[PDB]
Amino acid sequence: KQFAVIGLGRFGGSIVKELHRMGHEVLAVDINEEKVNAYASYATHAVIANATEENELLSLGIRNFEYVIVAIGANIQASTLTTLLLKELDIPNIWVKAQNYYHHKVLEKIGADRIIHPEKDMGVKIAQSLSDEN
Amino acid sequence: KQFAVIGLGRFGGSIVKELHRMGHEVLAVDINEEKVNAYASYATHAVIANATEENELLSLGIRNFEYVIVAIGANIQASTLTTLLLKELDIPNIWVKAQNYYHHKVLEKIGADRIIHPEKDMGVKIAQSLSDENVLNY
Amino acid sequence: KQFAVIGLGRFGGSIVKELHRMGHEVLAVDINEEKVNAYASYATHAVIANATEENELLSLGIRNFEYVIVAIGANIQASTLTTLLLKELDIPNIWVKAQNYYHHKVLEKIGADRIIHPEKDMGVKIAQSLSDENVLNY
Amino acid sequence: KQFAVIGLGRFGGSIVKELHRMGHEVLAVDINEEKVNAYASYATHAVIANATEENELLSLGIRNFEYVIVAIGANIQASTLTTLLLKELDIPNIWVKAQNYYHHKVLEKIGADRIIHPEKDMGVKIAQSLSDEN
Amino acid sequence: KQFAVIGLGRFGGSIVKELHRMGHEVLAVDINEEKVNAYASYATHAVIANATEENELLSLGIRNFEYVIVAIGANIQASTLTTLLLKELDIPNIWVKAQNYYHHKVLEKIGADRIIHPEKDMGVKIAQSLSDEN
Amino acid sequence: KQFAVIGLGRFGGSIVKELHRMGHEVLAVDINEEKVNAYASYATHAVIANATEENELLSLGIRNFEYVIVAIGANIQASTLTTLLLKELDIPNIWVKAQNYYHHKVLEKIGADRIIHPEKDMGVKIAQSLSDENVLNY
Amino acid sequence: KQFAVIGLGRFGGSIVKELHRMGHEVLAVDINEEKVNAYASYATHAVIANATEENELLSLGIRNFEYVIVAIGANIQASTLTTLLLKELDIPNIWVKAQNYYHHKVLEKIGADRIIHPEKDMGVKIAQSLSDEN
Amino acid sequence: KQFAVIGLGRFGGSIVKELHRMGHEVLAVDINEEKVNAYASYATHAVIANATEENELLSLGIRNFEYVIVAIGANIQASTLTTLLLKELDIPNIWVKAQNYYHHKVLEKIGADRIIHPEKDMGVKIAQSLSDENVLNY
């Protein structure tokens, strides 16, 4: 019922914006306040924080969400560490953006519920769209 | 019916793999052979080429395709340059991956038929999956 | 006759300064006021604007100029996007600074009337000055 | 009569190419051998070296040139240190690319013979060309 | 029966040296050849390579060892990625040096057989030594 | 019987935890309270102090201990300075963690009773475990 | 009569402290406010600022001093650029710490009044002290 | 009477050069020959050596000197280790360059006869020159 998104890059940003457009409540989190303010209006609660710190996480009240999307990209370690902490906080559904096959491998082992490869997935979706038009 | 994909990265290679899996003919193209070879088995043809070269584009007889997808990456000029080229070859449908906002607008004016923003686009689809977990009866 | 320079950096500002010094009318334009202000005294008019915005371009009545020089910097798309825009306004002469090789070819196809490569171009003039020290009778 | 160019960037590179096209002999130097080889054909003697080291300079036979163009850009320190060494080696004509007003200022003090601001100079050249066409 | 050690820092270096002193055969691997040569004499087969690359790994003939110690320290990602690849190559016993609790957590999940915290373990061993002396 | 550990990092804190678990009295000491507090429950006493300060060392009545372990980290001088200090207090046994080779030799001459190299030392123990898997009958 | 010191490192710091101990007024400037506050008590007017920016310089009231010591060390460029600006502001006495022979060379050209090599100068001072004791 | 300087960097080399210039005998010593050679002409003898090695120290017959200056650089342990070594040789006067505060206190306890802080020390002399411009009658 509740949606939280950590990592306001192109992916997470897009996700927070749609959820908002569909009239849902979203908790948008990100380290540098640049982003956190750029999505303040498109979110129900924008917060500057570091997902890799358990304390900032609990103070964030993250265990009160059923769906937490980790959209941190470049930094595989932060991404990995974050989903690991979330798994401990016992979040029911944690979806994570993966950067490659191995990042994907460990995410599985750590316990991620859904691993997303944005560019690859879009590619298969685009190829399908191509068939669907002669 | 005729499909050509230029730029075999995560996006492009992923569409070539899907078209193949559904039994469609696909011409895969890239600048380095490592990429070209790694997709030979997933495409009716995997050619090595620099799409920015109008002569190399003619060698591939690229004009015989109805759908060309430009999926070049980092090099934004490479992308718009390629799509400018195959647009003077009268290609019916040119779909291009857009790097950012200014890229999108220029591609729009260049005459691209469809513009894709991999991250953003997948972004709303995921948000739709999430939304469904609340709006739909489940 | 009338001259408009978009992008008041080293190159653009330097051309605005020279046209002024020779008593020509010049419309200087840039996104940040610091730049715009610092050229107010060297141009008949210095306006703050984002050349990528087609509405902002119309506000400047940019279509009343025969010569428009696009001297945007680092942001290569900003440059080609601007060039594309003012080419839709039928501007007679559009001169543009080219960042690199792919930018030059794109600009060429976009319809730019003249392409400048500051570093390379000044580069041959310098080489010519040096050559004169040997070839010319001195 | 003799021309040497240190710093095969856009500016220096272009300068080595014209001199070659005009059929003159040039000594093209640069630190990373990428460039040094890319201009091997367009120069009379391409050499990998560091202009900021007096020894690599003397071993380069630098004092046998009448005109030395220091085309190092980004690195203001290297650029400055280089013309400084050259001035000691007593080169008759040393022309240097300057990055800004202050870089320019110290180049005068160090003894540079001609200071070039590629973009600015081209700008005035371009404006003149603009008048010359109605 | 066979011992391989990837990561010739203070820890792995020490491990390779003892095994050698006990007259055992060891395969010492490390990226920068500085180390690889510094342990050439103290090892049965020193090799310059990157544990994070499957190819350099197979070409290393690593699946021919029963015990592989990953002693990469600072770089948690390389450490993690390495033990992950090894697990796929199906090495029977892979012992890894962990940098902290979380690094340790994922190493478990990835499938490490023994996780070592050098400084902490030594501390408990030192405290025991202290009791054992009045 | 009397145990004191200075420097509550991975090494030092780990020895304090072990001594406690075996029911020994331990005086834990460090410069920042976060460290001191996090070990209060594992030591008969957790004091905040800068071991380099000879006056702060006397306040702790450190001279009443037979075994003092210097486990300061990165700051190599801090380590040798501390061990120089408690050596002029006539402490019977001073065990110190050595940062490297020159540190070891200087500690040796300073009068340290036992020198520990955490990484190297654990290194040979692990190699011994491995060796046993071959030399011992298993 | 007026003393200003830019660059509160070991050298500059020490210089601000003595002048203060001798009961003189000093203007101590430095970029990172760590230092600027650490010398607040030992100076007559500590200020956070960047010597390489003319505006921060004039706003600093720099041209009201007869002696300005540029004690910036590592950053040769900043050091050089700074004495260059000061020379323009027309400071009567500008003493600069030099990092090496060449840094020293350009400082002369720029117009520095006294160039100091702390370690070398101390070395000769120490040798003299050595003779003076049998 | 006789002087030995270990560590021929800016500080050490500069003291070797001055003693030479005043006609005093000086034994310069350093680990790399480039340094040793470059001071051969400014000293009665320039030897290559690692002062941390007690055997190398004896080879130099360093015990025949009344004044030994330790001017090793960055490697702080190298400095204190050397100081410790030649203090076991009963050298009458040992002057050492101190890197920082903890190094000074250690050196102090090690038995160094004089501690120099090049930057800070030159720092007060400069401040004194400046002060003289106000306090002295000029």
Ligand SMILES: NC(=O)C1=CN([C@@H]2O[C@H](COP(=O)(O)OP(=O)(O)OC[C@H]3O[C@@H](n4cnc5c(N)ncnc54)[C@H](O)[C@@H]3O)[C@@H](O)[C@H]2O)C=CC1
């Ligand atoms: N970052 C850049 O400037 C560029 C990135 N790219 C590519 O884009 C791809 C990734 O796209 P994006 O997600 O848009 O980039 P990104 O890596 O910048 O986005 C991740 C987002 O996560 C946030 N984040 C990182 N660590 C965090 C932490 N501990 N706690 C909370 N938030 C944290 C960042 O602030 C950022 O907004 C990569 O493959 C990269 O190579 C391409 C060009 C430029």
Ligand SMILES: NC(=O)C1=CN([C@@H]2O[C@H](COP(=O)(O)OP(=O)(O)OC[C@H]3O[C@@H](n4cnc5c(N)ncnc54)[C@H](O)[C@@H]3O)[C@@H](O)[C@H]2O)C=CC1
């Ligand atoms: N692969 C990398 O090193 C980096 C990728 N990124 C970002 O990661 C995201 C996903 O990466 P990809 O787009 O898959 O990587 P990519 O940019 O390498 O993919 C483009 C593909 O097009 C090919 N290509 C490039 N110029 C070509 C030309 N003129 N003719 C024919 N083929 C040509 C390339 O070889 C490549 O396989 C992108 O948004 C990208 O900007 C950011 C930094 C580095």
Ligand SMILES: NC(=O)C1=CN([C@@H]2O[C@H](COP(=O)(O)OP(=O)(O)OC[C@H]3O[C@@H](n4cnc5c(N)ncnc54)[C@H](O)[C@@H]3O)[C@@H](O)[C@H]2O)C=CC1
């Ligand atoms: N200024 C900088 O921070 C850097 C400059 N460079 C390079 O240095 C060289 C010389 O620098 P410049 O070109 O003078 O610097 P520049 O790139 O800032 O100059 C372009 C000028 O156009 C203005 N501009 C940018 N987008 C605009 C828009 N949409 N509408 C109107 N005005 C717009 C900018 O504010 C600026 O005054 C260039 O080749 C550049 O690529 C490289 C790195 C950084």
Ligand SMILES: NC(=O)C1=CN([C@@H]2O[C@H](COP(=O)(O)OP(=O)(O)OC[C@H]3O[C@@H](n4cnc5c(N)ncnc54)[C@H](O)[C@@H]3O)[C@@H](O)[C@H]2O)C=CC1
């Ligand atoms: N370097 C870059 O990636 C970019 C530079 N720019 C702009 O381009 C302008 C300068 O253009 P370029 O000259 O092409 O760039 P550049 O600074 O890379 O070229 C200078 C040349 O000097 C050589 N060099 C540097 N130190 C040397 C040394 N000690 N001995 C011998 N050779 C040495 C370099 O290898 C290089 O080829 C600047 O205003 C900069 O802001 C804009 C975009 C990217």
Ligand SMILES: NC(=O)C1=CN([C@@H]2O[C@H](COP(=O)(O)OP(=O)(O)OC[C@H]3O[C@@H](n4cnc5c(N)ncnc54)[C@H](O)[C@@H]3O)[C@@H](O)[C@H]2O)C=CC1
């Ligand atoms: N590296 C340094 O200069 C210093 C490290 N430390 C501390 O020391 C601790 C770690 O100690 P060490 O293991 O001795 O340091 P370390 O991190 O340098 O040693 C790891 C060893 O693994 C090797 N290695 C790294 N990536 C590799 C790869 N992909 N394939 C093969 N070999 C690879 C390295 O060459 C190195 O010899 C850390 O907690 C660190 O903070 C303290 C001071 C300095």
Ligand SMILES: NC(=O)C1=CN([C@@H]2O[C@H](COP(=O)(O)OP(=O)(O)OC[C@H]3O[C@@H](n4cnc5c(N)ncnc54)[C@H](O)[C@@H]3O)[C@@H](O)[C@H]2O)C=CC1
């Ligand atoms: N913790 C860090 O940020 C880094 C650690 N390393 C290396 O990681 C390895 C393991 O780390 P540790 O030694 O556990 O870390 P550490 O160096 O922080 O541990 C020493 C402990 O002694 C305390 N301490 C320091 N000076 C003191 C003084 N004067 N009086 C009283 N207590 C004092 C510190 O607060 C700390 O808890 C070491 O070999 C270290 O060199 C390398 C780089 C950074």
Ligand SMILES: NC(=O)C1=CN([C@@H]2O[C@H](COP(=O)(O)OP(=O)(O)OC[C@H]3O[C@@H](n4cnc5c(N)ncnc54)[C@H](O)[C@@H]3O)[C@@H](O)[C@H]2O)C=CC1
């Ligand atoms: N910085 C370091 O961590 C170390 C430096 N050293 C050596 O110490 C010597 C220099 O000693 P210090 O002066 O103490 O070092 P330093 O270079 O850090 O001190 C210079 C001072 O100038 C200030 N400064 C720099 N740029 C400035 C600007 N634009 N405006 C205002 N203030 C500015 C800095 O904040 C600093 O306090 C060098 O030979 C260096 O190799 C040795 C070890 C460490």
Ligand SMILES: NC(=O)C1=CN([C@@H]2O[C@H](COP(=O)(O)OP(=O)(O)OC[C@H]3O[C@@H](n4cnc5c(N)ncnc54)[C@H](O)[C@@H]3O)[C@@H](O)[C@H]2O)C=CC1
């Ligand atoms: N030279 C460099 O790369 C750096 C110097 N600095 C700082 O710059 C300042 C001035 O530099 P210097 O002290 O002159 O440089 P330095 O540290 O190299 O000078 C010490 C001299 O002692 C010699 N030496 C070192 N260990 C020795 C041993 N065991 N036996 C005999 N000789 C030995 C060295 O080869 C050198 O000639 C210092 O405060 C230093 O900490 C800071 C960073 C780097």
